[PDB]
Design a protein around this ligand. Structure first.
Ligand SMILES: CO[C@@H]1[C@@H](n2cc(-c3cc(F)c(F)c(F)c3)nn2)[C@@H](O)[C@@H](CO)O[C@H]1S[C@@H]1COC[C@H](n2cc(-c3cncnc3)nn2)[C@H]1O
Ligand SMILES: [Cl-]
Ligand SMILES: [Cl-]
Ligand SMILES: [Cl-]
Ligand SMILES: [Cl-]
Ligand SMILES: [Mg+2]
Length: 138
């Protein structure tokens, strides 16, 4: 039981081999969820499950620079279910973020923002009950 939207500080930003783990439960009749890895006002990595975009479930990922969204990267593999407990793991790798949901690889997102050590906050928003948000090095 964390309040959403939630901000998780990432002290000194991110680095390869840093693992961020988000645990929560999707609300019944969910519409949207977002994780925003921020570099100040920029969004280095936005990870955004949409439960009803034109009656399809899709994951949208993108980057926001100087208040402008870039080119979306879309994934129709959709591992979330309304009402169910989930685990999102975001592993920072040298060239990409790697995302696994419920221990199954979902997607990678190549780094657009290159100053990894300035990506110093993770925002968590949308239609979830949030249980925990933490990080470790592996
Ligand atoms: C509603 O605005 C979103 C942005 N967004 C989401 C949130 C958000 C905030 C929260 F508090 C949340 F809890 C939360 F989950 C999400 N805040 N900003 C962000 O997700 C951004 C990422 O690019 O998208 C915009 S909507 C963007 C607008 O312009 C057209 C884009 N469009 C449509 C299609 C297309 C392609 N193929 C098939 N069908 C439709 N393709 N592109 C569309 O996706
Ligand atoms: Cl959205
Ligand atoms: Cl659903
Ligand atoms: Cl940068
Ligand atoms: Cl930041
Ligand atoms: Mg590569």
């Amino acid at each position: 039981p964390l309040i959403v939207p939630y901000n998780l500080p990432l002290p000194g930003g991110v680095v390869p081999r840093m693992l961020i783990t988000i645990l929560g439960t999707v609300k019944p009749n969910a519409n949207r969820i977002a994780l925003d890895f921020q570099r100040g006002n920029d969004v280095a990595f936005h990870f955004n499950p949409r439960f009803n975009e034109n009656n399809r479930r899709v994951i949208v990922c993108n980057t926001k620079l100087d208040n402008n969204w870039g080119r979306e990267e879309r994934q129709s593999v959709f591992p979330f279910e309304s009402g169910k407990p989930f685990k999102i793991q975001v592993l920072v790798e040298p060239d990409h973020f790697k995302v696994a949901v419920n221990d199954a690889h979902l997607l990678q997102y190549n780094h657009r923002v290159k100053k990894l050590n300035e990506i110093s906050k993770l925002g968590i928003s949308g239609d979830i009950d949030l249980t925990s948000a933490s990080y470790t090095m592996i």
